[PDB]
Amino acid sequence: MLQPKRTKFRKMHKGRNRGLAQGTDVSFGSFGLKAVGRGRLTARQIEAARRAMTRAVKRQGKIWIRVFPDKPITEKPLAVRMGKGKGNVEYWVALIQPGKVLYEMDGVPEELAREAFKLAAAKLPIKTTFVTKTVM
Amino acid sequence: AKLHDYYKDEVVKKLMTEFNYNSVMQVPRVEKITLNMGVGEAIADKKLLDNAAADLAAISGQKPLITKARKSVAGFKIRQGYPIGCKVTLRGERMWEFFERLITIAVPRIRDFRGLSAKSFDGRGNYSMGVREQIIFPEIDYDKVDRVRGLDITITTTAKSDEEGRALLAAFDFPFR
Amino acid sequence: MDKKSARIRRATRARRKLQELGATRLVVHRTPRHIYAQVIAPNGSEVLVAASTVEKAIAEQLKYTGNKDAAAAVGKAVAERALEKGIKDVSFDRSGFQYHGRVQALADAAREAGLQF
Amino acid sequence: MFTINAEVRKEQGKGASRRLRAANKFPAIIYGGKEAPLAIELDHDKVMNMQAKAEFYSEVLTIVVDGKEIKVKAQDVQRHPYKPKLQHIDFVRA
Amino acid sequence: MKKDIHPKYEEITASCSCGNVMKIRSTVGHDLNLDVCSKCHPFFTGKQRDVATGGRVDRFNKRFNI
RNA sequence: UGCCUGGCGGCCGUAGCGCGGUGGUCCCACCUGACCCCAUGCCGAACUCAGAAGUGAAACGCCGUAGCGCCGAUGGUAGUGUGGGGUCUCCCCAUGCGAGAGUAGGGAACUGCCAGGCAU
RNA sequence: UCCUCCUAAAGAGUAACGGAGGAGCACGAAGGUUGGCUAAUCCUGGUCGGACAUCAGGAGGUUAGUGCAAUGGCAUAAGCC
RNA sequence: CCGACUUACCAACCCGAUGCAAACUGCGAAUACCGGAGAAUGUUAUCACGGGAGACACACGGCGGGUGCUAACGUCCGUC
Ligand SMILES: [K+]
Ligand SMILES: [K+]
Ligand SMILES: [K+]
Ligand SMILES: [Mg+2]
Ligand SMILES: [Mg+2]
Ligand SMILES: [Mg+2]
Ligand SMILES: [Mg+2]
Ligand SMILES: [Mg+2]
Ligand SMILES: [Mg+2]
Ligand SMILES: [Mg+2]
Ligand SMILES: [Mg+2]
Ligand SMILES: [Mg+2]
Ligand SMILES: [Mg+2]
Ligand SMILES: [Mg+2]
Ligand SMILES: [Zn+2]
C-alpha cells in the first residue's frame, strides 16, 4: 500500500483543496480515467480500484497510477477530549482536483478499457470520466 | 644538470621530428618530481615518522614536508591534523640530478628487475611508480636501517597524453619493461 | 587560477575601500618589461595623470625598463606631473602586488618628489 | 481541406473571454510571420468537430477573417480541464 | 634553498666494476663503488632465462632417442 | 581620423559556456638566470630580483559558429481588491489589477577616459 | 526563563495542553591587524594501503566550512594559514 | 586465485517524460504598509500636557487559518 518510504516531517496541516489539477492529459497510455469531482483519495481506495481493473484485463497490458498518497491524516482515539496535542497519524491521502488523470492504460482494446475503468470507478469516492490520448 | 643538456640537445629535437610539433614550446617538459612516504604508523610512534623523514632527506637531499591528515577517518583511527606521511618535491637542477641517479644507479638495484610497467600513466602524461624497499638508494646505509620502508615516485610532465609522455621518458632510456 | 585573476582577487579589497573613502588613488601596474602609473579621479573613471616606461621620453633615459631604476624614474616623473596639476595628496593602490622592490622604489620615489601618501 | 471562418475580437481580457465561451464562441490568436498578432474569435462547435480529425494538426488550415483569408497551422490548444471543450487556440502563419 | 635546514649535498665520483665511471651529487662523502649500473645490468639480454621454460618435446625426445 | 594592444571604469548572462580559425614590429604571456633584494611549514611552483635567445605551444585578445545557458512578446489561463449571487468543503456575475510556465522570436554584448604601436 | 523555524494572511506584531529543535557556554586565542590562500565529492596512476590515510593529475564549482540548534548571511570572504 | 553464464528479483548516479510540499524557491501578483506632491471636502476630524474615569468574562456573521471528523450554536488567532 502506497506510502512515502520516509518523510521529512510526520504531521501536516489540513490545508485547503482549491484549484484545478495539473496533469490533465494522458501521457503514457492510450486511455485513462479522469477525475471530475474534488476530494481525497486514500491509499486503500487507490489500491482497491487498482485491483479491480487488473482483474478485468486479466493482467494484460500495462497500468500507470498517476496519483500518489503523500499527505498524512491524523485522528484521535475514541473517548478523548480536545487538546493535549495533535492526534496520531492514521492513513495517507492524495488531494484530487477536477481534471487530474488518475490512471492510464494501454495494450488492450478500448471496449475492454472502458469496462475495466468502469469497475475501478465504482471504488472511488469522486466522480470520474473516461478519456483518450489526443494528438497534440 | 647533465641530463638537462641531453634534453636540450637530443630529446627535444628527436621528439620534434617524431610528432612533428610546430613549436619547440610544444615539446613536453618535466615540471617536477615528487617523493611520498605514506608512513601511516606515525599514529603509533612519532620516532617512526622522524626516521622516515630522515630517509627521504638522505635520498632527496632536502628536508621533507610532513603531511597532515586532510580529514578524520575512523577506519584508520586518524584524527584531522595527525601526521600521516611526508613528501618532497624536486624542481630544477636537483630534480635532474635525482632523475639521473634514479635511472643510472637506483633502479638497477631493484630485485628481479625486468623493467618498469609502460602502462603506469594517469592518462595525462604523468608517470608514477612505487619502490618496495629503501635499499635501492646507496645513500641509505644498509648497516643502520631500522625498518623496511618504500616510497612513491611521481613524475609530472607537460605532456598532453600518455603516448607523448611515454615517448618523452623512453627518450631517456627510462627502463620500461 | 591564472596569475592575472589571482592578482585581481588580491587587489579587490583595497580598491573597494578606497572607493568608499572617495580618495584619489595612484594605481601602479607592473610587468616584466615595463611599469606603469596612473592617477585616477575619485569617480575611478577618468585619468588625471599617467606615466609609463613605454613613453619614449622616459625610456630614452634608461639602461633597461624592467628594473628598479626605471621604476624610480616613473615615480619621480608621475609625481612632478601630478603636482603640476595640484594633485598633491593621493592614496597608493598597490593593485595586488607586494609593496616590494620595483613597486616600493616607485612609491618612495614619488614621496621624495613631494606627493603626500 | 479545412476552412474556418473567424471574426476579429473587439474586446479582450478575462471578462470578455468568458462571455464569448458562454455564447458558444471561443477566442484564438494568429501570430508569427512579420505582421503583428491578429486576435480572432471562432465558432466552437464547428472547430471542435474539425479538430477531432488528426489531419487538423498536421495539415495547413486556412482561416477566412472578415474578407481576408490566411493560411496557418495549429500551434497550440488549451482544452477545458475536464469537459470536451476548447479554451483557446494558437495559430502560426504559414 | 633555506640555508640552514638541508643536509650536506656534495659531488661524488662513482665507479662500477663494469668499468663505467661517473660523477653524481649525493648526501654522502664516500666514492660510490657499484656492482651494477644501467649500462651493464643484464635486463636487455637476460629475459631468455624464462623462454627456456616453454619447451617440452625437445626434452622428451632425449629420452625417446635414448 | 581609422586599426590593434594595455590599464582604470560604466554594466552585470542578448554580456556566460562549448566548437572551429587566428596574432608576436610594438604590447602581453610563456620564457633565461638567481650568488644578490626577497621567498618556500620542503622546492625560485608561488612571491621577488637581474634580463631578452626562443615561442605564440599554453594562456589571453580577435573572428566565425545557435549544441547549451540567457532574453522574450501577443493572446489565453491562474490568482485577486470592491459590490452582488449560488447548488456555499467550493464557485459564479459587474468592474479594476493580472501572473508563472510555455509559444513566435531575439541572441556569439555595448560603451567612457588615459597611454602606446601601425596607417593617415 | 531565554534562542531559531513554521502557524503568521509578501511592513511590524499576532493565540492554542499547535508542529519541530536548542541554551543555562567556550576562547589571551577561537580577539586586533598585515600578508597569503580557496571547498565537498568522484574518476584515473602509484610501496605496505584495504570501500576509506599520504602523493600526482583531472572533473566539479561551494553541493564544503562557520567552537555548539535553526534561520539569514559569507569569495572583497565572515572559511583556511 | 583471478572469474564465466543466468535471473523466479532489487537496482544508486546520469538522461527523457509526470506529479506533490506549513517548516522547498533559479519565479511571483492583487491588496496592505512607509514616504512625497496636488485639488476638493471634513464643526481640528491630528498631536502634547493636565483633571475624572470605566473596562481587562465578550457573542455571532463574512473572509484568511491552526485544532477537531474542512463535526459542533466547539475551540484558538488575524481583519471587517
Ligand atoms: K553567447
Ligand atoms: K511570520
Ligand atoms: K485624559
Ligand atoms: Mg471578475
Ligand atoms: Mg510579517
Ligand atoms: Mg500582512
Ligand atoms: Mg586578509
Ligand atoms: Mg548556511
Ligand atoms: Mg483578567
Ligand atoms: Mg468565562
Ligand atoms: Mg480575557
Ligand atoms: Mg476573541
Ligand atoms: Mg463559539
Ligand atoms: Mg475553525
Ligand atoms: Zn656497470
Swiss-Prot record, chain B:
Coiled coil: none annotated. It comes from the Bacteria. Transmembrane segments: none annotated. Signal peptide: none annotated. GO terms for biological process: cytoplasmic translation; ribosomal large subunit assembly; translation. The keyword Ion transport does not apply. It holds the Pfam family Ribosomal_L5. The modification N6-acetyllysine is found at K2. This is one of the proteins that bind and probably mediate the attachment of the 5S RNA into the large ribosomal subunit, where it forms part of the central protuberance. Its 5S rRNA binding is significantly enhanced in the presence of L18. In the 70S ribosome in the initiation state was modeled to contact protein S13 of the 30S subunit (bridge B1b), connecting the 2 subunits; the protein-protein contacts between S13 and L5 in B1b change in the model with bound EF-G implicating this bridge in subunit movement. In the two 3.5 A resolved ribosome structures the contacts between L5, S13 and S19 are different, confirming the dynamic nature of this interaction. HAMAP family: Ribosomal_uL5_B. Part of the 50S ribosomal subunit; part of the 5S rRNA/L5/L18/L25 subcomplex. Contacts the 5S rRNA; cross-links to the P site tRNA. Forms a bridge to the 30S subunit in the 70S ribosome, contacting protein S13 and S19. Belongs to the universal ribosomal protein uL5 family. This is Large ribosomal subunit protein uL5.
UniProtKB/Swiss-Prot annotation, chain C:
InterPro entries: Ribosomal_uL18_bac-type, Ribosomal_uL18_bac/euk. Residues 1-17 are annotated as: Required for binding of the 5S rRNA/L5/L18 complex to the 23S rRNA. Keywords: Phosphoprotein, Ribonucleoprotein, Ribosomal protein, RNA-binding, rRNA-binding. Coiled coil: none annotated. GO terms for molecular function: 5S rRNA binding; structural constituent of ribosome. The protein has been shown to contain a phosphoserine, which was required for the protein to bind to 5S rRNA. However, the presence of this phosphoserine is controversial, and it has not been seen by mass spectrometry. SUPFAM superfamilies: Translational machinery components. The keyword Cytoplasm does not apply. GO terms for cellular component: cytoplasm; cytosol; cytosolic large ribosomal subunit. GO terms for biological process: cytoplasmic translation. The basic N-terminus is not necessary for binding to 5S rRNA. It is however required for cooperative binding of L5 and L18 to 5S rRNA as well as for binding of the 5S rRNA/L5/L18 complex to the 23S rRNA. This is one of the proteins that mediates the attachment of the 5S rRNA subcomplex onto the large ribosomal subunit where it forms part of the central protuberance. Binds stably to 5S rRNA; increases binding abilities of L5 in a cooperative fashion; both proteins together confer 23S rRNA binding. The 5S rRNA and some of its associated proteins might help stabilize positioning of ribosome-bound tRNAs. HAMAP family: Ribosomal_uL18_B. Part of the 50S ribosomal subunit; part of the 5S rRNA/L5/L18/L25 subcomplex. Contacts the 5S and 23S rRNAs. The gene is rplR.
From Swiss-Prot, chain D:
InterPro entries: Rbsml_bL25/Gln-tRNA_synth_N, Ribosomal_bL25/Gln-tRNA_synth, Ribosomal_bL25_short, Ribosomal_L25_dom, Ribosomal_uL5_bac-type. The keyword Ribosomal protein applies. This is one of the proteins that binds to the 5S RNA in the ribosome where it forms part of the central protuberance. Binds to the 5S rRNA independently of L5 and L18. Not required for binding of the 5S rRNA/L5/L18 subcomplex to 23S rRNA. Keywords: Ribonucleoprotein, Ribosomal protein, RNA-binding, rRNA-binding. Pfam families: Ribosomal_L25p (PF01386). It comes from Escherichia coli (strain K12). This is Large ribosomal subunit protein bL25. It comes from the Bacteria. GO terms for biological process: cytoplasmic translation; negative regulation of translation; response to radiation; ribosomal large subunit assembly; translation.
From Swiss-Prot, chain E:
Proteolytically cleaved by protease VII to yield a peptide lacking residues 63-70. It is not clear if this is due to protein degradation or is a bona fide processing event in the strain used in PubMed:339950 and PubMed:10556732. In strains B, D10, MRE-600 and Q13 the only protein seen in PubMed:10556732 was full-length; the last 7 amino acids were sequenced only for strain MRE-600. One of its GO terms (biological process) is negative regulation of cytoplasmic translational initiation. The keyword Ribosomal protein applies. It comes from the Bacteria. Its cofactor is Zn(2+). The modification N6-acetyllysine is found at K8. NCBIfam families: L31, PRK00019.1, PRK00528.1. Part of the 50S ribosomal subunit. This is Large ribosomal subunit protein bL31. The lineage of its organism: Bacteria, Pseudomonadati, Pseudomonadota, Gammaproteobacteria, Enterobacterales. The gene is rpmE.
